[PDB]
């Protein structure tokens, strides 16, 4: 492309004497980098297109999460629009929960990881700008399904072969009779939670362009879908109940397998 190409090179010149490693490509030169030289170091966030809007509104997300005391980076700036934007952040410290951690440390990861779930569930939700509930998700998979954004060739094995059609009949049909909100990540998978290889604490919460009030079973359904694994991610059986016990502590609902489904079919649109 070409709005992208300015604005990697408007961003190189921005960072002179940092070196770039990319952690993620796409597009053009379309993904996420680490930035790093002399020993500062910064991750670098560009979006291909509405993947762009997403972005200003990250930085935005990023700031207020700041504030209100959870673990984020702190952001050095982000820009463009539609079709091309980005985002820099101070670089956090640490190892994903993503990787493979010491078989000793797991469950500590799982803790932790439920931990920091508890820590944005305790927010009031009333005090957050974002809005991500289902009065702005569901239109959002419709508009998903119609443009033919939605990857149908690698959903969830329950769902080989659906159409976006069907994907999006299934979704209106199980929708929850009611949200027990709080503010949520929107996609709290173990890659956007990074660590202190040495604690465990939690360093860092990263892709927060979801942000905003939903359900706390949107943020459940995707950690749960994660720990369910023992290879990639390595979890499995044991961390999902040391994850649900500490959650627990915390909150003395309730945690419903049916609002899990439906935020795992949610999340097959993005």
Same mark, same amino acid.
């Given at each position: 492309?070409?709005?992208?190409?300015?604005?990697?090179?408007?961003?190189?010149?921005?960072?002179?004497?940092?070196?770039?490693v990319?952690?993620?490509?796409?597009?053009?030169?379309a993904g996420?980098y680490?930035?790093?030289?002399?020993?500062?170091?910064? !991750?670098?966030k560009?979006?291909?297109?509405?993947?762009?809007?997403?972005? &200003?509104? $990250?930085?935005?997300?990023?700031?207020?999460?700041?504030?209100?005391?959870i673990?984020?980076?702190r952001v050095?700036?982000?820009?463009?629009?539609?079709?091309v934007?980005?985002?820099?952040?101070?670089?956090?410290p640490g190892?994903?929960?993503?990787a493979?951690?010491?078989?000793?440390?797991?469950?500590?990861v799982?803790?932790?990881?439920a931990?920091?779930?508890?820590?944005?569930?305790?927010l009031?939700?009333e005090?957050?700008? !974002?809005?991500?509930? &289902?009065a702005?998700?569901?239109?959002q998979?419709?508009?998903?399904? +119609? $443009?033919?954004s939605?990857?149908?060739e690698?959903?969830?094995?329950?769902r080989?072969?659906?159409?976006?059609?069907?994907?999006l009949?299934?979704?209106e049909?199980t929708?929850?009779?009611?949200?027990?909100?709080?503010?949520?990540?929107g996609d709290?998978?173990?890659?956007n939670v990074?660590?202190?290889?040495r604690?465990?604490?939690?360093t860092?919460?990263?892709?927060?362009?979801?942000?905003?009030?939903?359900?706390?079973?949107?943020?459940?359904?995707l950690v749960?879908?994660?720990?369910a694994h023992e $290879?990639?991610?390595?979890?499995?059986?044991?961390?999902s +109940?040391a994850? &649900?016990?500490?959650?627990?502590?915390?909150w003395?609902?309730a945690?419903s $397998?049916?609002?899990?489904?439906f935020?795992?079919? &949610?999340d097959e !649109? !993005?």
């Amino acid at each position: 492309h070409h709005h992208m190409d300015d604005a990697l090179r408007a961003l190189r010149g921005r960072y002179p004497g940092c070196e770039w490693v990319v952690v993620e490509d796409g597009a053009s030169g379309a993904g996420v980098y680490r930035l790093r030289g002399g020993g500062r170091e910064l !991750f670098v966030k560009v979006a291909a297109l509405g993947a762009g809007v997403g972005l &200003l509104g $990250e930085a935005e997300r990023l700031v207020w999460l700041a504030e209100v005391g959870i673990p984020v980076p702190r952001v050095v700036e982000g820009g463009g629009d539609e079709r091309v934007a980005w985002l820099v952040t101070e670089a956090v410290p640490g190892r994903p929960a993503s990787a493979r951690w010491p078989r000793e440390q797991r469950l500590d990861v799982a803790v932790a990881l439920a931990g920091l779930a508890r820590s944005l569930h305790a927010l009031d939700w009333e005090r957050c700008p !974002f809005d991500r509930s &289902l009065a702005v998700t569901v239109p959002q998979a419709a508009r998903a399904v +119609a $443009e033919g954004s939605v990857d149908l060739e690698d959903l969830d094995e329950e769902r080989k072969g659906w159409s976006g059609e069907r994907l999006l009949a299934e979704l209106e049909r199980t929708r929850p009779a009611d949200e027990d909100l709080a503010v949520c990540h929107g996609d709290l998978c173990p890659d956007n939670v990074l660590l202190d290889p040495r604690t465990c604490e939690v360093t860092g919460l990263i892709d927060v362009g979801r942000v905003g009030r939903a359900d706390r079973h949107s943020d459940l359904a995707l950690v749960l879908r994660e720990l369910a694994h023992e $290879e990639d991610p390595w979890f499995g059986p044991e961390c999902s +109940a040391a994850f &649900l016990r500490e959650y627990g502590r915390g909150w003395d609902g309730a945690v419903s $397998e049916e609002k899990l489904a439906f935020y795992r079919l &949610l999340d097959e !649109f !993005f």
